[PDB]
């Protein structure tokens, strides 16, 4: 009973009844952009690799 | 007399090799152009 009563008092000092409109969306978009930029790079590199591979072989 | 005959193959082969290099070069330059354009405005 001691612990629950203390917890209720703590909630009575931290409650305000508003939705708290912070968030973390922008940095997550930026990081996703960077990952797909790296993927583009990896695709083009593989293509160059295969054309050089086929020229070296005759 | 046969020298001409033999020379031609090396010219054609070399020309073919040059053509192949052209495809690789235009491809690499397009890749670098794309990465420049995409990276220029990441800010």
UniProtKB/Swiss-Prot annotation, chain A:
Location within or outside the cell: Nucleus
Entry keyword Ribosomal protein: no
UniProt-recorded Gene Ontology molecular function terms: transcription coregulator activity; ubiquitin protein ligase activity
Main location: nucleus
GO cellular component terms given for this protein: core mediator complex; mediator complex; nucleoplasm; nucleus; ubiquitin ligase complex
UniProt record, GO biological process: positive regulation of transcription elongation by RNA polymerase II; positive regulation of transcription initiation by RNA polymerase II; protein ubiquitination; RNA polymerase II preinitiation complex assembly
Keywords carried by this UniProt record: Acetylation, Activator, Disease variant, Epilepsy, Neurodegeneration, Nucleus, Transcription, Transcription regulation
Record's keyword annotation contains Metal-binding: no
Superkingdom to which the source organism belongs: Eukaryota
Membrane-spanning residues: none
Family to which the UniProt record says this protein belongs: Belongs to the Mediator complex subunit 11 family.
Subunit structure: Component of the Mediator complex, which is composed of MED1, MED4, MED6, MED7, MED8, MED9, MED10, MED11, MED12, MED13, MED13L, MED14, MED15, MED16, MED17, MED18, MED19, MED20, MED21, MED22, MED23, MED24, MED25, MED26, MED27, MED29, MED30, MED31, CCNC, CDK8 and CDC2L6/CDK11. The MED12, MED13, CCNC and CDK8 subunits form a distinct module termed the CDK8 module. Mediator containing the CDK8 module is less active than Mediator lacking this module in supporting transcriptional activation.
Biological function: Component of the Mediator complex, a coactivator involved in the regulated transcription of nearly all RNA polymerase II-dependent genes. Mediator functions as a bridge to convey information from gene-specific regulatory proteins to the basal RNA polymerase II transcription machinery. Mediator is recruited to promoters by direct interactions with regulatory proteins and serves as a scaffold for theee assembly of a functional pre-initiation complex with RNA polymerase II and the general transcription factors.
Implicated disorder: Neurodegeneration with developmental delay, early respiratory failure, myoclonic seizures, and brain abnormalities: An autosomal recessive disorder characterized by congenital microcephaly, profound global developmental delay, exaggerated startle response, refractory myoclonic seizures, progressive widespread neurodegeneration, and premature death.
Name of the featured protein: Mediator of RNA polymerase II transcription subunit 11
Record organism: Homo sapiens (Human)
Swiss-Prot record, chain B:
Keywords associated with the record: Acetylation, Activator, Coiled coil, Nucleus, Transcription, Transcription regulation
GO biological process, one term: positive regulation of transcription initiation by RNA polymerase II
Compartment(s) of residence: Nucleus
Listed GO MF terms: nuclear thyroid hormone receptor binding; nuclear vitamin D receptor binding; transcription coactivator activity; transcription coregulator activity; ubiquitin protein ligase activity
Described function: Component of the Mediator complex, a coactivator involved in the regulated transcription of nearly all RNA polymerase II-dependent genes. Mediator functions as a bridge to convey information from gene-specific regulatory proteins to the basal RNA polymerase II transcription machinery. Mediator is recruited to promoters by direct interactions with regulatory proteins and serves as a scaffold for the assembly of a functional preinitiation complex with RNA polymerase II and the general transcription factors.
Residues of the full protein shown: 136 to 178 of 178
Stated name of the protein: Mediator of RNA polymerase II transcription subunit 30
Gene Ontology cellular component annotations, sorted alphabetically: core mediator complex; mediator complex; nucleoplasm; nucleus; ubiquitin ligase complex
Tissue: Expressed in brain, heart, kidney, liver, lung, pancreas, placenta and skeletal muscle.
Bilayer-spanning residue ranges: none
Family (UniProt): Belongs to the Mediator complex subunit 30 family.
Oligomeric form and interacting partners: Component of the Mediator complex, which is composed of MED1, MED4, MED6, MED7, MED8, MED9, MED10, MED11, MED12, MED13, MED13L, MED14, MED15, MED16, MED17, MED18, MED19, MED20, MED21, MED22, MED23, MED24, MED25, MED26, MED27, MED29, MED30, MED31, CCNC, CDK8 and CDC2L6/CDK11. The MED12, MED13, CCNC and CDK8 subunits form a distinct module termed the CDK8 module. Mediator containing the CDK8 module is less active than Mediator lacking this module in supporting transcriptional activation.
Organism: Homo sapiens (Human)
Coiled-coil intervals, chain numbering: 1-38
């Amino acid at each position: 009973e001691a612990e629950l009563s203390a917890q209720i008092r703590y909630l009575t000092q931290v409650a305000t009844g508003q939705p708290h409109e912070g968030s973390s969306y922008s940095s997550r978009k930026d990081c996703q952009m960077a990952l797909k930029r790296v993927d583009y790079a990896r695709l083009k590199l593989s293509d160059v690799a295969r054309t050089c591979e086929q020229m070296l072989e005759n | 007399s046969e020298e001409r005959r033999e020379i031609a193959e090396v010219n054609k082969k070399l020309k073919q090799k040059n053509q192949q290099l052209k495809q690789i070069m235009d491809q690499l330059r397009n890749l670098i152009w794309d990465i420049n354009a995409m990276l220029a405005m990441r800010n």
